[PDB]
Every structure is written in structure tokens, then in C-alpha cells.
């Protein structure tokens, strides 16, 4: 996170920490006791699929309290239409091997219904993005979970307000921009997979996933998040499906 602040312990209860071989990898979002939503690209270079760990109730990577819960990722479901090294369909559905315990420090973010999110949440100006990523573009990662309030823009406005960088990824209907173009606030690489939570009349809902952007908080650029509303039905059919033999699974999409 760039230009944000520390999420007080317990105020970002759905933030998930993803590890591979005990090492920090990415953020994620718990949406029920058994499933975690993250970004697909977080697995582009994974080789030890039996060594993926999802940690919930985390806050300070340097301390250890009893709010921490760990689980092995039993399955990483990425859309078939996703291409490693690219940006479209940047989403992953992780099945935890054993459910997590819901407490004051570990709670899931609500996955909303497609139309509610497109017709209502999408027009809620501000939403919170969070993670243990880089505090500056190319800097070290955060020790304490950071959170940032970012304003959303419709793609037409994003493009119009962004500086062209020949041969840069297209903003598709499966993405959307959020952030600022003055170089002060945006999410960063280390936050990949983290949530973009929208507050609406008392409840917080999952609307986006930290996916990509032109560097981190670059002038004339905004962050790009996976437009989760496009995958609601995708995520629901999978959560009701039987676990496959392997860890990695590519499910057709639509």
C-alpha cells in the first residue's frame, strides 16, 4: 500500500495472508469459513503446490498472538481463460483444507449478487484496498497490514484520465480502475490478491481484487482491480463443486 495507514488490529478481519514455503506471497479475501478469493497471477511462478498456506487473523508479521489461524491451501482454482504473465481474468478461488474459526478477528467479507454490485456497489465512490505490500514503488513491504481508501472510476474516465503507455495491457470489462493519478495513493504488487471492499448500508462487500497497474502510484495512472461482479456465478458454481484430485485446477469461464 502506498500513501495509506495501518488497519487497526481487527478492522480488516477478512484480509488473508498467502504464503508459499513460509514466504510472503500475496493477499487474499475470506468470503466464508472455507473459501478464499485472491488473484490468479499470484500463482504464475509456483512450483511447490503442496506448500501454499493461508493465514487469517493476521496483523503484524513481526508478532504472534492467538488470533492467527493457518490452513493449507487444498486447491487453487483459476479461470481457464487466464494466461500466466498477463492481466485479464486475474482471479483465483482457493479452497482451504480445513475450515477456519470465525472470531472477532477473523470474519468473511460478503460476496454480493451480480446485479446488486453492478447497479449499486459500483457507484459507491469510495472502497478500501489493503495488504502487506510495498509502501513505495520498489520499496520494502509492510510489517503491519495497511489499508487505503480509493475512489472508483468507470473505464471510460480511467482511459481519458490516464497517460498512454504504448503496448500496455487493455482495461477490459473484467477490470476497473480505482485510485489517484497524482502519485500519492494506490495499492502495490505485494498487495496482489487483496480485497477492494465496498461499504454499503452497514455491510461490506467484495467488489475487487488488487490486480495490476503501471508501477505503483505513478503520476497519470490508477490502480486496476479485477471486477469481481463478473465472476459471481463462476465462484458460486465452484464452491458447490467437488474437490478435484490435484491442487491446481482450471475451470472454464464463462
Amino acid at each position: 500500500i502506498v500513501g495509506g495507514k495501518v488497519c487497526p488490529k481487527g478492522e480488516c478481519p477478512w484480509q488473508v495472508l498467502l504464503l508459499v514455503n513460509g514466504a510472503q506471497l500475496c493477499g487474499g479475501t475470506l468470503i466464508n469459513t472455507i473459501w478464499v478469493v485472491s488473484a490468479a497471477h499470484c500463482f504464475d511462478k509456483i512450483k511447490n503446490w503442496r506448500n501454499l498456506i493461508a493465514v487469517l487473523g493476521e496483523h503484524d508479521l513481526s508478532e504472534h498472538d492467538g488470533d492467527e489461524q493457518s490452513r493449507r491451501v487444498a486447491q487453487v482454482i483459476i479461470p481457464s481463460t487466464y494466461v500466466p504473465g498477463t492481466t485479464n481474468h486475474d482471479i483465483a478461488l482457493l479452497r482451504l483444507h480445513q475450515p477456519v474459526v470465525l472470531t472477532d478477528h477473523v470474519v468473511p467479507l460478503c460476496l454480493p449478487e451480480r446485479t446488486f454490485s453492478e447497479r449499486t456497489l459500483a457507484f459507491v465512490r469510495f472502497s478500501l484496498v489493503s495488504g502487506w505490500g510495498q509502501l513505495l514503488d520498489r520499496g520494502a513491504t509492510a510489517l503491519e497490514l495497511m489499508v487505503l481508501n480509493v475512489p472508483r472510476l468507470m473505464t471510460q474516465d480511467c482511459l481519458q484520465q490516464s497517460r498512454k503507455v504504448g503496448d500496455s495491457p487493455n482495461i477490459t470489462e473484467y477490470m476497473f480502475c480505482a485510485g489517484y493519478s497524482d502519485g500519492s495513493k494506490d495499492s502495490c504488487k505485494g498487495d496482489s490478491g487483496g480485497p477492494h471492499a465496498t461499504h454499503y448500508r452497514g455491510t461490506w462487500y467484495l467488489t475487487g481484487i488488487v490486480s495490476w497497474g503501471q508501477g505503483c502510484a505513478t503520476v497519470g495512472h490508477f490502480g486496476v482491480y479485477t471486477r469481481v461482479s463478473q465472476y459471481i456465478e463462476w465462484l458460486q458454481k465452484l464452491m458447490r463443486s467437488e474437490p478435484r484430485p490435484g491442487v491446481l485446477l482450471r475451470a472454464p469461464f464463462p
Binding site: 470465525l102 460478503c110 460476496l111 446488486f116 447497479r119
Partner: protein, 142 residues
């Protein structure tokens, strides 16, 4: 207006334009100076655009120059107060007043719904948790 011989009488704004309708010529004879005549003629000849009673549902029309302004009653809006604020109970309008989910219904009225872990209250628009840790809620603040 003009009648037999009245023109012999000096000009009067009261008798010619107030108590009667006066053409530009008569008006010009009262103010003499061109500009003064124009300054008067713009308003005098504009005509009350509120005559047609354009403001609806009890609104109040305030005349302007070749136009008007409507002041509506609390429950109305629109150029002519034609919009019924109560006839806008559809989902796309502020989520139909629903707290969580909203479903339109051709003809009838929209219905409100909730996310798993919640139930629809008696007001038919709110949702309360039906479990200890419903999604989207932060314990250390509840």
C-alpha cells in the same frame, strides 16, 4: 391604445400602458429617449409565460423573460413539477430503499432480500444477522 382625438392629449404611462395596452410608438412617446423606451418595452411586451399554468401538482409559477420557474411542493420536482417522487420505487433508484438486495417486479412493487446469514425484517427492507459472525460486519465495532 388610441381613440378619436386622445392623441391631442400629452402622453401618460398610466392611461396608455397601465389602463390600456400601448404599442411601441405610444410607449416611445412617453419615454421619448430610445433606450428608456427599450428598457420598458422588453418587460412590457414579453408577456407572462405563467399564463398557461405550466407548473403542475400545486407548484408555483414565477414569471421571467420569455420563460418561467416552477416552485414545487415537497413531494415533486421537474421543470413543471411533473415528477412524482413517490413513483420512483425501482431498484436502480437508491437500491429501492433496500438495505441489501433489491429485485424489480414488472407491475407490482420491488421486493427486498438479504445475503446468507441474514433475514428480512418486518419492515421488508432491512436485514439483521442470523448467525454470530455474518459476512461484511466487523466485531470490534459492533
Amino acid at each position: 391604445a388610441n381613440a378619436f382625438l386622445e392623441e391631442l392629449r400629452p402622453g401618460s404611462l398610466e392611461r396608455e400602458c397601465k389602463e390600456e395596452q400601448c404599442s411601441f410608438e405610444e410607449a416611445r412617446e412617453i419615454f421619448k429617449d430610445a433606450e428608456r423606451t427599450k428598457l420598458f418595452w422588453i418587460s412590457y411586451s414579453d408577456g407572462d409565460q405563467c399564463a398557461s399554468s405550466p407548473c403542475q401538482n400545486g407548484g408555483s409559477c414565477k414569471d421571467q423573460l420569455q420563460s418561467y420557474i416552477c416552485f414545487c411542493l415537497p413531494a415533486f420536482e421537474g421543470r413543471n413539477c411533473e415528477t412524482h417522487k413517490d413513483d420512483q420505487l425501482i431498484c436502480v433508484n437508491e437500491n429501492g430503499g433496500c438495505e441489501q438486495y433489491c429485485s424489480d417486479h414488472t407491475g407490482t412493487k420491488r421486493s427486498c432480500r438479504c445475503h446468507e446469514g441474514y433475514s428480512l425484517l418486518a419492515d421488508g427492507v432491512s436485514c439483521t444477522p442470523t448467525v454470530e459472525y455474518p459476512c461484511g460486519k466487523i466485531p470490534i465495532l459492533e
